[PDB]
């Protein structure tokens, strides 16, 4: 009975505000706006119900009433700003935007959260997408042009002349930008209280019919940003950095770039050439597929017996097996219906924290061109200044930072410092000094301390937020060394204290997500190349790398060849290639896991024949087989020792791993 | 939620996007951008995309990508369409979500029912065949939206397969539901669904072999666009429809050639498959004055303006009717007046007044009657050709046939509704057959009460009969009544009687032979057929009215007709009834329509009186 009364009040407020067909402000509009604000605030935190927002979304208040308020105020604001009760006509938009940011606030569910919040999270996440869907498509999304008025009114006055109260207005308006663009589809929380049936989840599309994946992607957000001029707003806000406009702004312009790769920026009928190439690749893989299918129908009945050792007469069907004995053996292998158990595992805005390499958001060519220059202009305007502004705050309240701050800060830092270096690599028009300002000693030691502290608390996500920056630390050290003593103080503290941390993560993180494993291989590849120009010892750092779990975690990445790219396979294979003659530690490489992956590599079903990956790999595997034959021919026990793991006995450790 | 994306799919989507938004194809014009604006104007959601335009762009790469894997690429094409339509104008999507339907037409090649192979599944075809049966327009579930019976959680956008697939799990982690849901019919999206049964064309059937049939599914705006009998050229994806009985349904059970098995949802039963086309576009290959004018191109408007302002337009039209027939100007004039017709007035009491003109071309067996009938049936729209021999079981009017209930078989007089029913050999059809059309020729309705069926069917047709005289050759020594087997009730319903004779004239035969041989060798009409058709359509919009003096002249002419037709000692008219007065009115209206004038002058009534008088003074 309480819920339907709440619905009655929401409907009563809906018909009290007014409507169209020009929208009309009803009597006591401010009073009803304040009443709605008070009710929503009371039910949000004081009572923790999350039901008033639901009723508002139901009456389509945000679309039918709230948006037209700002749209109707926009023309009056333009007329007043071009002509040359303004306070009453200005304060009306304040409450509307305060309501908008409150409803657009992301919803977080944890164990401490009550059942109502988790129950309504799945029913309100779709409405969250609805809000951003209707906002972006509302006549070029001009509501953001009205939003920036709620900031330029306060920022216009002198910064030293700021207001102890009006200062919260800037935070409230700024939160709206980061809230609207952080809206992403949620997860279908399957009810796992009982065993699931012989069929899985039917539909994973968490989108209401009014919401389409076309109209909610970050491409739409970036197009709306460009068409609403707010690029100038974001540039001018950063141009006047010289506190409260730093923490929100850290993620206001980061959300749409939290997971967008920089490779799509440069291509390296224009879109149709890649279309033709992809058609060629899929034609090749389909051609490889049909090599197994019989020339005739399945019911042709091709039966055979393999005269296997012991004169066995095992019967396996299939005319395909009559072509090759290997096909018959594979049909023998996959005939078994028994399988083992494979164990498996975002609380913060989804991104690298949960995005596979192929999740490249489609961009319009014009939109891509605009976004290419927008971020470059931001870097040329205020990048290092913004970093130095938050350097002081980062040095304090180390234990007072919620896990959201690390994931929203470290990813931003690493992504932009990586983008600057790749942009400088592709084109020389950008100086390295534009990113060289991040080599400050205090910033480096603080970020390293955060990375090491995240290890002991089992905060794997926060630690993965740190490796992505640690890779670019070594990359930038190399870039500023080759293109050149400031780099020494940043790249000499990893002598004894930091070697354990970098040499332990690969041995333990192999039982987690793919990206966690991908971080460590890049770390090792970068660290093996930064020190090559000075060699504290080349033969000593590599000694701690040649360990069996390290080889296991490197070879576990190779099993995903159906999705590994040229560089992903290149780094993994080059790690073993660079130690073939420089280290000569191939004895630990003698597990069957690498041999079966080599068989998969050279097989046409794996790597592409026309590409430039399988040729050098095939030649190196040809040499690998020669090494295997030479080492196996000299030890009969090594024929079966190749399968079993190595031993801890003293004499055999040098007898087998080194051959006396 | 981790979902892998087929990069080829988004590449095809982007290429389709650029093709749609910047095609700009004889001056440069973005035809598809204007097409999307056209859709916004009238809210229609069918994008007729020519395949040649898609093939010329991207040097055919995108065209091949579509034509090979259409079924998998279709959702990406829809998303690319949504991108462009939203970018140009967000006037889509009491919000009512808009579902789009991409239509591809003008494919380079056209297949047939015989050329169906299972290796073309999931590809674009252009199947052509003759439709023999069409089902009802039923609404099929497209994007379901279920609400679970407890906790009232809404599961939405549940994609539907050929089955009645419903969600298996509840998003709220407190609802126990694996088979219990209540579909929200109001929230769900439905699509028009029609199943047409096409077959091989007659000329494509090998001798002896039975025609091969197919079941083509029509969805969206392409429903009811393929009527039975019409040879259509369907185009769309070719799919295969499984036996949903084996898949398991909430309300039925599997019922008992090579069926595969082993699916988790199947168990021990097998699954059989049936090829069925899924058409996305179908085309057949076999009104105030201002409204008509606005639908006509300016170049045609010029030609029509030249006609209407002409001085000798009437005689030119008369000479331009059936150019391949030599002589017979009176019959040409009568045929011309037939197409224009009268005004189908309806009085205040509800009595309907006939406005159609009936002609009967009686003539010697060597004359050109059937040529006139064939020209009319080949020129006048909604016209049929039939004989008195009564070919079909249904007569000239209608019949009831038992189904092994009763149903109505449409006769010749009904298929030509609102048109011309060119009846040939009007004498051959028997007197017991003439009594059927007495009502259909005057009251213009056919009333049938046979068995469990009772209907008053509509026949608003103008009959152009062609009857040979009794005895083969016309006998001028007798009146028109003697030479024709028709009786007075049916002879009075014909407005005009035209008698054409092959007089044994040595000279006339020379012009006839020179004319026929001249045609076979190659007639110059002052108005071509397509040029005259628009004039007739324009003139039909006129509804002439009788002026005050026209009424007096009409009454006087009718009095003269009845006075000159008086017979017997009791002064009992035989040939001229009030139907002849209504015939004078109808002919006056038709003549005034020929001159494209909205007022009927006494000159028109005098001409109509001459036309009637010449058909009865035959003694």
């Amino acid at each position: 009975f309480s819920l339907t009364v709440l619905r009655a009040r929401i409907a009563l407020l809906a018909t009290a505000i007014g409507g169209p067909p020009p929208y009309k402000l009803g009597d006591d509009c401010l009073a009803c706006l304040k009443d709605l604000k008070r009710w929503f605030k009371l039910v949000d935190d004081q009572q923790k119900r999350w039901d008033v927002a639901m009723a508002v979304a139901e009456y389509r208040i945000l679309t039918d009433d709230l948006l037209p308020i700002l749209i109707d105020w926009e023309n009056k604001c333009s007329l007043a700003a071009k002509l040359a009760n303004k306070a009453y006509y200005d304060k009306i938009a304040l409450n509307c935007l305060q309501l908008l940011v409150l409803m657009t606030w992301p919803l977080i569910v944890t164990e401490q959260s009550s059942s109502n919040q988790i129950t309504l999270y799945g029913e309100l996440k779709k409405h969250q997408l609805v809000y951003k869907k209707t906002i972006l498509s509302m006549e070029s999304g001009k509501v953001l042009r009205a939003a920036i008025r709620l900031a330029l009114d306060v920022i216009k006055i002198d910064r030293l002349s700021r207001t102890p109260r009006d200062n919260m207005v800037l935070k409230l308006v700024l939160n709206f930008f980061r809230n609207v663009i952080a809206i992403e589809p949620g997860e279908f929380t399957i009810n796992t209280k009982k065993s699931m049936p012989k069929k899985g989840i039917t539909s994973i599309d968490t989108l209401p019919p009014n919401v389409s994946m076309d109209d909610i992607s970050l491409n739409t957000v970036i197009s709306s940003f460009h068409k609403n001029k707010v690029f100038g707003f974001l540039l001018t806000l950063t141009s006047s950095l010289s506190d409260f406009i730093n923490i929100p702004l850290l993620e206001i312009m980061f959300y749409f770039t939290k997971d967008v790769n920089q490779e799509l920026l440069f291509p390296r009928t224009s879109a149709g050439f890649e279309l033709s190439k992809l058609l060629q690749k899929e034609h090749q893989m389909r051609k490889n597929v049909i090599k197994h299918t019989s020339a005739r129908h399945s019911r042709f009945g091709g039966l055979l017996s393999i005269q296997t050792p012991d004169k066995t007469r095992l019967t396996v069907s299939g005319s395909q097996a009559l072509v090759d004995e290997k096909i018959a053996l594979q049909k023998l292998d996959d005939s078994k219906k028994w399988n083992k158990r494979i164990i498996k595992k975002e609380g913060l805005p989804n991104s690298l924290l949960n995005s596979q390499t192929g999740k490249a958001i489609f961009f319009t060519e014009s939109n891509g061109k605009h976004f290419k220059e927008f971020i470059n202009n931001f870097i040329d305007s205020g990048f290092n200044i913004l970093l130095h502004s938050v350097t002081n705050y980062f040095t304090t309240e180390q234990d007072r930072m919620v896990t959201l701050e690390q994931v929203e800060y470290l990813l931003f830092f690493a992504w932009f410092v990586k983008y600057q270096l790749l942009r400088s690599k592709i084109d020389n028009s950008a100086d390295i000094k534009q990113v060289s300002e991040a080599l400050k000693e205090v910033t480096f030691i603080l970020v390293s301390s955060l990375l090491r502290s995240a290890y002991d608390l089992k905060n794997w996500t926060v630690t993965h937020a740190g490796m992505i920056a640690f890779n670019e630390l070594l990359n930038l050290v190399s870039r500023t060394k080759a293109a050149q003593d400031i780099e020494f103080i940043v790249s000499r503290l990893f002598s004894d204290e930091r070697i354990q941390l970098l040499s332990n993560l690969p041995k333990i993180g192999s039982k987690y997500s793919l990206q966690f494993m991908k971080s460590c291989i890049e770390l090792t590849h970068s660290v093996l190349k930064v020190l090559e120009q000075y060699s504290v010892n080349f033969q000593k750092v590599q000694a701690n790398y040649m360990t069996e779990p390290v080889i296991e975690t490197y070879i576990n990445f190779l099993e995903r060849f159906r999705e590994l790219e040229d560089d992903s396979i290149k780094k993994v294979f080059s790690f073993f290639h660079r130690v073939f003659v420089q280290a000569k530690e191939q004895a630990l490489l003698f597990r069957f896991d690498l041999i079966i992956l080599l068989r998969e590599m050279l097989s046409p079903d794996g790597l592409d024949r026309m590409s430039r990956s399988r040729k050098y790999v095939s030649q190196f595997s040809d040499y690998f087989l020669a090494r295997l034959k030479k080492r196996l021919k000299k030890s009969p026990a090594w024929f079966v020792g190749l399968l079993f793991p190595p031993l801890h006995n003293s004499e055999v450790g040098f007898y087998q791993r080194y051959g006396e | 939620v981790k979902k892998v994306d087929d990069v080829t799919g988004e590449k095809v989507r982007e290429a389709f996007e650029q093709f749609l938004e910047d095609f700009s194809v004889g001056e440069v014009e973005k035809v598809y951008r204007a097409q999307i604006e056209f859709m916004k104007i009238y809210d229609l959601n069918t994008i007729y995309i020519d395949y040649q335009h898609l093939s010329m762009r991207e040097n055919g790469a995108l065209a091949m990508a579509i034509s090979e894997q259409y079924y998998r690429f279709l959702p990406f094409l829809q998303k690319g369409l949504r991108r462009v339509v939203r970018k140009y104008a967000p006037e889509l999507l009491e919000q009512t979500e808009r579902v789009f339907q991409i239509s591809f037409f003008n494919l380079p090649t056209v297949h047939r029912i015989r050329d169906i192979r299972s290796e073309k599944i999931g590809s674009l075809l252009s199947i052509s065949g003759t439709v023999t049966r069409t089902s009802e327009v039923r609404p099929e579930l497209y994007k379901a939206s279920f609400t679970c019976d407890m906790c009232r959680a809404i599961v939405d956008n549940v994609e539907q397969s050929f089955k009645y697939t419903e969600p298996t799990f509840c998003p709220n982690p407190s609802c126990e539901n694996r088979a219990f849901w209540t579909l929200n019919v109001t929230r769900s999206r439905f699509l028009d669904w029609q199943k047409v049964r096409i077959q091989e064309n007659a000329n494509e059937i090998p001798t002896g072999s039975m025609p091969r049939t197919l079941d083509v599914i029509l969805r969206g705006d392409s429903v009811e666009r393929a009527k039975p009998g019409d040879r259509c050229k369907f185009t769309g994806v070719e799919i295969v429809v499984p036996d949903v009985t084996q898949l398991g349904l909430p309300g039925v059970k599997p019922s008992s050639n090579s069926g595969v098995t082993g699916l988790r949802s199947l168990g021990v039963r097998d699954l059989t498959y049936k090829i069925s086309f899924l058409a996305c576009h179908v085309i057949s290959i076999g009104r105030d004055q201002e409204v008509f004018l606005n639908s006509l191109s300016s170049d045609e408007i010029n030609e029509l303006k030249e006609m209407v302002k002409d001085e000798h337009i009437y005689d030119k039209l008369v000479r331009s009717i059936a150019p391949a027939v030599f002589g017979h100007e009176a019959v040409k004039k009568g045929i011309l007046l037939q197409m224009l017709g009268g005004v189908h007035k309806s009085t205040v009491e509800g009595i309907k007044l006939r406005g159609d003109i009936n002609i009967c071309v009686v003539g010697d067996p060597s004359t050109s009657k059937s040529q006139f009938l064939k020209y009319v049936v080949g020129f006048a729209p909604r016209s049929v050709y039939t004989s008195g021999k009564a070919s079909s079981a249904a007569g000239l009017t209608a019949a009831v046939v038992r189904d092994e209930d009763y149903t109505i078989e449409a006769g010749a007089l009904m298929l030509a509704d609102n048109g011309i029913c060119c009846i040939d050999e009007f004498d051959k059809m028997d007197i017991s057959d003439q009594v059927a059309i007495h009502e259909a020729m005057e009251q213009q309705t056919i009333s049938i009460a046979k068995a469990g069926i009772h209907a008053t069917l509509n026949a608003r047709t103008s009959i152009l009969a062609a009857a040979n005289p009794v005895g083969g050759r016309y006998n001028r020594k007798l009146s028109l009544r003697g030479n024709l087997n028709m009786t007075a009730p049916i002879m009075s319903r014909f407005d005009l009687f035209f008698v054409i004779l092959d007089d044994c004239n040595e000279k006339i035969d020379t012009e006839l032979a020179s004319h026929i041989v001249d045609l076979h060798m190659k007639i110059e009409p002052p108005f071509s057929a397509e040029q005259l058709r628009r004039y007739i359509k324009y003139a039909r919009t006129f509804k002439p009215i009788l002026t005050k003096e026209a009424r007096s002249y009409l009454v006087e002419k009718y009095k003269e007709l009845r006075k000159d037709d008086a017979q017997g000692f009791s002064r009992s008219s035989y040939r001229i009834t009030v139907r002849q007065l209504e015939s004078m009115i109808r002919l006056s209206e038709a003549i005034a329509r020929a001159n494209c004038v909205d007022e009927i002058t006494p000159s028109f009534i005098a001409e109509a009186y001459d036309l009637l008088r010449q058909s009865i003074i035959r003694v």
Binding site: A11, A14, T15, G19, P20, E58, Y59, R60, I61, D64 | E94, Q95, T186, R187
Partner: peptide
């Protein structure tokens, strides 16, 4: 107490 005018301004989407 809604007027006939409110009836015309749908609040519930459907």
């Amino acid at each position: 107490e809604l007027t006939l005018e409110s009836l015309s301004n749908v609040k519930a989407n459907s």
